[PDB]
Amino acid sequence: PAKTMEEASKRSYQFWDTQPVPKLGEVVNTHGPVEPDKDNIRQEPYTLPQGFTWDALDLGDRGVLKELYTLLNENYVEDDDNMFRFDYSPEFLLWALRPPGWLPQWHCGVRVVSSRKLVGFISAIPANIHIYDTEKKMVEINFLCVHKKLRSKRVAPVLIREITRRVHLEGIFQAVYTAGVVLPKPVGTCRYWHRSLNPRKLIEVKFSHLSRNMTMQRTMKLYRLPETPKTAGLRPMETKDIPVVHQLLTRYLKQFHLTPVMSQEEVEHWFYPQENIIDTFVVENANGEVTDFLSFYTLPSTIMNHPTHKSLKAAYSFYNVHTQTPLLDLMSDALVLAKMKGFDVFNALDLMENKTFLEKLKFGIGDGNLQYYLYNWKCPSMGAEKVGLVLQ
Amino acid sequence: XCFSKPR
Numbered sequence: 001p002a003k004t005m006e007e008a009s010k011r012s013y014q015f016w017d018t019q020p021v022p023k024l025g026e027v028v029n030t031h032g033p034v035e036p037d038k039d040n041i042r043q044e045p046y047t048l049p050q051g052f053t054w055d056a057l058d059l060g061d062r063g064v065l066k067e068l069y070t071l072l073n074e075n076y077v078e079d080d081d082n083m084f085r086f087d088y089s090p091e092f093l094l095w096a097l098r099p100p101g102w103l104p105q106w107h108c109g110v111r112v113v114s115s116r117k118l119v120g121f122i123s124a125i126p127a128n129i130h131i132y133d134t135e136k137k138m139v140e141i142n143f144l145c146v147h148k149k150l151r152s153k154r155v156a157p158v159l160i161r162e163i164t165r166r167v168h169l170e171g172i173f174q175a176v177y178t179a180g181v182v183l184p185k186p187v188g189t190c191r192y193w194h195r196s197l198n199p200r201k202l203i204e205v206k207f208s209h210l211s212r213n214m215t216m217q218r219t220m221k222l223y224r225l226p227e228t229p230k231t232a233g234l235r236p237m238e239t240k241d242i243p244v245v246h247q248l249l250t251r252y253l254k255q256f257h258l259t260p261v262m263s264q265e266e267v268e269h270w271f272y273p274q275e276n277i278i279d280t281f282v283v284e285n286a287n288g289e290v291t292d293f294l295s296f297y298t299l300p301s302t303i304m305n306h307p308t309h310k311s312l313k314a315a316y317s318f319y320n321v322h323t324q325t326p327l328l329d330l331m332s333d334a335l336v337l338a339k340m341k342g343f344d345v346f347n348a349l350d351l352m353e354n355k356t357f358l359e360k361l362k363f364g365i366g367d368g369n370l371q372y373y374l375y376n377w378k379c380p381s382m383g384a385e386k387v388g389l390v391l392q
Numbered sequence: 393x394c395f396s397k398p399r
């Protein structure tokens with residue numbers, strides 16, 4: 001793969017040159033589809049190599065959900081040095097893959113014919129996306145995974161074409177997705193930052209290591225946190241808060257250039273707290289008005305090849321809306337809440353207004369860029385601070 | 393979607 005724009009300039013993209021995306025080299029000054037909507041769609045699934053078959057995964061079958069968990073737990077994204085792998089839980093996967101409007105045929109698996117072993121996956125979920133001055137029904141593509149023994153055999157281009165076909169069959173012709181690799185052609189480039197919460201554990205697993213020159217003692221004291229949040233009236237989101245959280249989010253996001261447009265049902269799905277999946281806290285002020293909220297989701301990782309520590313418990317910044325409480329105070333309380341809940345690290349991207357608090361709250365810049373992409377939509381790229389969209 | 397660790 002190509003993780004930098006340098007190694008990507010030196011590559012030729014045999015697959016992506018065939019797709020309706022802009023070329024890496026060109027710069028974009030227009031707004032609109034790369035190609036028109038198709039009015040006739042291929043009815044037949046694309047051909048797989050011999051011995052493999054398509055299978056749409058019904059995640060309501062607990063056994064099928066577990067097969068997908070295992071495939072991802074063993075074969076999904078790792079860090080650059082093969083030390084950590086994402087470990088999405090089964091319940092998290094249900095959250096991410098069954099939002100309102102989900103379709104079973106958009107949970108697109110590949111199985112071995114003989115054994116029935118799940119060896120490949122890709123998914124789509126519908127979302128309304130606001131991109132500059134246009135709102136489009138799109139899909140979000142997530143969880144592209146090919147078994148390790150099956151790699152470098154073109155299975156991934158077939159998975160992309162097959163989910164494209166199945167999305168086209170439903171009348172949708174644009175998509176949004178992210179990746180750690182550079183591809184034609186990022187609409188924005190964001191950077192992960194990390195806030196140590198349990199610096200001891202993070203150093204013995206080499207997730208981070210001591211800054212020069214500092215002792216383990218100095219490092220702990222530097223990252224210590226209060227034991228309770230400071231903001232008045234902070235409390236977990238409840239059912240009664242769904243409309244006002246929807247209203248707050250909708251107004252807050254109008255200031256960015258790539259955002260979701262959520263219905264009130266989608267707000268309930270994405271923010272209503274679920275233990276070990278998503279946490280949302282609202283600020284209810286002295287008048288009983290909800291004026292701010294913070295949210296973060298739960299995504300641990302496997303620590304590979306380690307005798308004693310098997311997993312890292314990571315919290316990920318989701319959407320944080322402020323209208324009365326300072327963003328800095330809001331995020332400082334998110335750190336405290338994550339610490340209280342047992343998380344080892346708190347991750348956040350530099351999108352939206354996050355740059356205004358990352359350094360002050362002692363985040364350390366990561367080695368990973370997260371590139372954002374649109375399929376069949378041509379528009380100018382944007383700076384990270386204008387991206388107002390967070391995926392799982 | 394992409395696994396980062398401190399630079």
Ligand SMILES: CCCCCCCCCCCCCC(=O)SCCNC(=O)CCNC(=O)[C@H](O)C(C)(C)COP(=O)(O)OP(=O)(O)OC[C@H]1O[C@@H](n2cnc3c(N)ncnc32)[C@H](O)[C@@H]1OP(=O)(O)O
Nearest residue numbers: 013014015016076142143144145146151152153154155156
């Ligand atoms: C209208 C609806 C449209 C919907 C479709 C919208 C597009 C959705 C697009 C997908 C959005 C996914 C969003 C997420 O989930 S991002 C997460 C990506 N998943 C992982 O990294 C999991 C761990 N890795 C793997 O399982 C494998 O390495 C994968 C699955 C990547 C296969 O890898 P393998 O090593 O077996 O490769 P190959 O020989 O089969 O095929 C090689 C071709 O694959 C291109 N490639 C490699 N990685 C990615 C990637 N991450 N996104 C898009 N394309 C990628 C690569 O440049 C090359 O093309 P070109 O270099 O020849 O040009």
Ligand SMILES: [Cl-]
Nearest residue numbers: 057058059060
């Ligand atoms: Cl399902």
